[PDB]
């Protein structure tokens, strides 16, 4: 099928210790701005660094002087890890990334409840970009509405809680308006005073 | 850096005494998958993903075998400087509205970790019922944060995190 | 350099034979091979650092055992005759491109 | 995924070139190494060519890489009578970082002299 390759970690030559890699590929527009930055971390300084922008190995502490020096050298290692821009983030992108990561979409629960304040409650949704506005007898209230942080669930959910301060006399109705790019329409929920 | 994507690939954290690693991949923020070290198997966070896409476990194998090298190599190299340790905080919050009577799940979410390593628990009496613990995440100052998920049935909590920068064990409740 | 021990050996069915290999070359990764006709070389064993040892291809019916950097040991508990083959040990660096073999281990397993 | 090599055996007359035929059924494979093994020793590395070339020269002894096909051929020319030995054509897809190869069967040129 459509795989996902990691870089390759360049090997070097009580208390506790603790040794820490990864390569951060960053994609601006798609894959037309791809920058691509491994770091090797010992005891949560970081030493040394590879950045695409400068095309080889330097050194962020006296400590990695050694293993930036030696990996510049050896081109069956430098020029590996400048092609791991190509062979980890451009690859990985442009293959199970858009068959996963980028194809999920989740659309939001958007339930209203009152705790006087309402509460909209939109859960459970992927991506990020969601806007959520009150309406209250059809009229935009930005006055007296706080929401929280885009909050990460940790299971590719999020979850945003938007509380509006108001004051029911029978009749009047407050709507919740969600926008998301998983929905065809826009949600609306309405909650009749 | 600016950017509007972030993979983060190939994670690989060693740490010794103890003979403890992790390689996981990351998309956004969020856990692609890890590779269980033991049964050697890569452990999808979304089983579709699973189904759509692949990585096999040795590469993961593989790269924490450089990154264990690596440790002793640096462990040596600076004079056998200990890690400095870190006072985790946690905050608990749930997956969807709390409806008394309703399955949910429970939330919490304990960050600036540092070794990673946590014990992470849930009445004022122990629970171990639907548990399910994320793994370890990377932190832009190479810190962790970790989060633990606890299924309840409401009705009328402490998250319990013990660590070592941590003089007393802390509670958040609920 | 990557020598093996022993270089022949005669064997019953249903003992147990011990093959090993030492390396010299700083090498991480070491893996154990056989050789029979028809069938090419076939992967058994590899391992890519000491305590570690990994499933290879022919897993059935030999263990692997690398206690060190530099030895790693091929083991049979209870040899059968479709054990008798030509065994070769290899190592080679972290992502190297080069595998380094040994001279070769004749075994011969007979009821 | 598997490796299929041609001819099963190849008996030359020192002067001719060799030709040792491979194929590969895994689109994946970008480094494809050579190794020879001289009678009663191990195999060894003889030459390797990466996916992004189409030949790799060295001596007598010459990878030629086809993409579109999935084929290479090593062609050996001058061919000596110590060239006689079996040849292995290998292969790894070097992305997924498994430390595994993949062995063709071999085939076994016998030079005469």
């Known amino acids: 099928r459509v795989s996902y390759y990691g870089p390759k970690t360049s090997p070097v030559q009580e208390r506790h210790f603790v040794y820490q890699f990864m390569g951060e590929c960053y994609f601006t527009n798609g894959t037309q701005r791809i920058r691509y930055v491994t770091r090797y971390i010992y005891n949560r300084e970081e030493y040394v660094r590879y950045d695409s922008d400068v095309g080889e190995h330097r050194a962020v502490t006296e400590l990695g002087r050694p293993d930036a020096e030696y990996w510049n050298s050896q081109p069956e290692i430098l020029e590996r890890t400048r092609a791991e821009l190509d062979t980890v983030c451009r690859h990985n992108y442009e293959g199970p990334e858009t068959h996963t990561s980028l194809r999920r979409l989740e659309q939001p629960n958007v339930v209203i409840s009152l705790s006087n304040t309402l509460v909209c409650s939109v859960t459970d949704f992927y991506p990020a970009k969601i806007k959520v506005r009150w309406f209250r007898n059809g009229q935009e209230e930005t006055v007296g509405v706080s929401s929280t942080q885009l909050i990460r669930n940790g299971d590719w959910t999020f979850q945003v809680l938007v509380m509006l301060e108001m004051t029911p006399r029978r009749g009047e109705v407050y709507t919740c308006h969600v926008e998301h790019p998983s929905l065809k329409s826009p949600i609306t929920v309405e909650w009749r005073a | 850096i600016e950017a509007d994507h972030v993979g983060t690939y190939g994670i690989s954290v060693y740490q010794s005494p103890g003979d403890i690693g992790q390689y996981t991949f990351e998309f956004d923020g969020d856990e692609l998958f890890y590779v269980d070290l033991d049964k050697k198997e890569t452990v999808w966070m979304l089983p579709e993903f699973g189904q759509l896409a692949s990585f096999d476990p040795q590469g993961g194998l593989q790269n924490i075998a450089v990154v264990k090298h690596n440790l002793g190599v640096l462990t040596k190299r600076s004079n056998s400087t200990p890690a400095t340790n870190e006072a985790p905080q946690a905050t608990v919050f749930p997956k969807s509205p709390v409806l008394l009577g309703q399955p949910n799940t429970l939330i919490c979410f304990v960050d600036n970790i540092f070794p990673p390593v946590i014990n992470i628990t849930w009445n004022s009496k122990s629970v171990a019922d639907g548990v399910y613990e994320t793994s370890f995440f990377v932190n832009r100052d190479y810190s962790f944060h970790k989060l633990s998920y606890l299924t309840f049935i409401p009705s009328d909590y402490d998250c319990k995190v013990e660590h070592w920068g941590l003089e007393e064990p802390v509670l958040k409740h609920w | 350099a990557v020598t093996q021990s022993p270089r022949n050996k005669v064997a019953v069915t249903g003992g147990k034979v011990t093959l090993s290999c030492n390396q010299t070359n700083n090498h991480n990764n070491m893996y154990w091979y056989r050789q029979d006709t028809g069938h090419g070389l076939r992967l058994i064993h590899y391992?890519?650092?000491?305590?570690?040892?990994e499933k290879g291809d022919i897993p059935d019916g030999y263990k692997a055992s690398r206690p060190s950097q530099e030895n790693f040991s091929l083991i049979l508990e209870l040899a059968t005759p479709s054990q008798t083959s030509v065994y070769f040990c290899?190592?080679?660096?972290?992502?190297?491109?080069?595998?380094?073999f040994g001279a070769g281990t004749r075994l011969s397993v007979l009821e | 995924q598997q490796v299929r090599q041609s001819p099963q055996s190849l008996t030359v007359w020192e002067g001719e070139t060799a030709i040792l035929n491979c194929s590969y059924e895994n689109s994946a494979f970008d480094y494809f190494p050579w190794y020879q093994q001289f009678p009663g020793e191990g195999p060894a590395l003889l030459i390797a060519i990466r996916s992004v070339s189409d030949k790799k020269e060295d001596g007598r002894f010459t990878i030629f890489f086809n993409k579109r096909e999935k084929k290479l051929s090593l062609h050996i020319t001058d061919s000596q009578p110590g060239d006689s030995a079996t040849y292995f054509c290998?292969?790894?897809?070097?992305?997924?970082?498994?430390?595994?190869?993949?062995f063709g069967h071999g085939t076994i040129l016998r030079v005469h002299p």
């Open positions: 391992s890519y650092g000491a305590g570690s040892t």
């Open positions: 290899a190592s080679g660096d972290f992502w190297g491109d080069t595998l380094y």
């Open positions: 290998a292969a790894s897809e070097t992305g997924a970082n498994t430390g595994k190869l993949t």
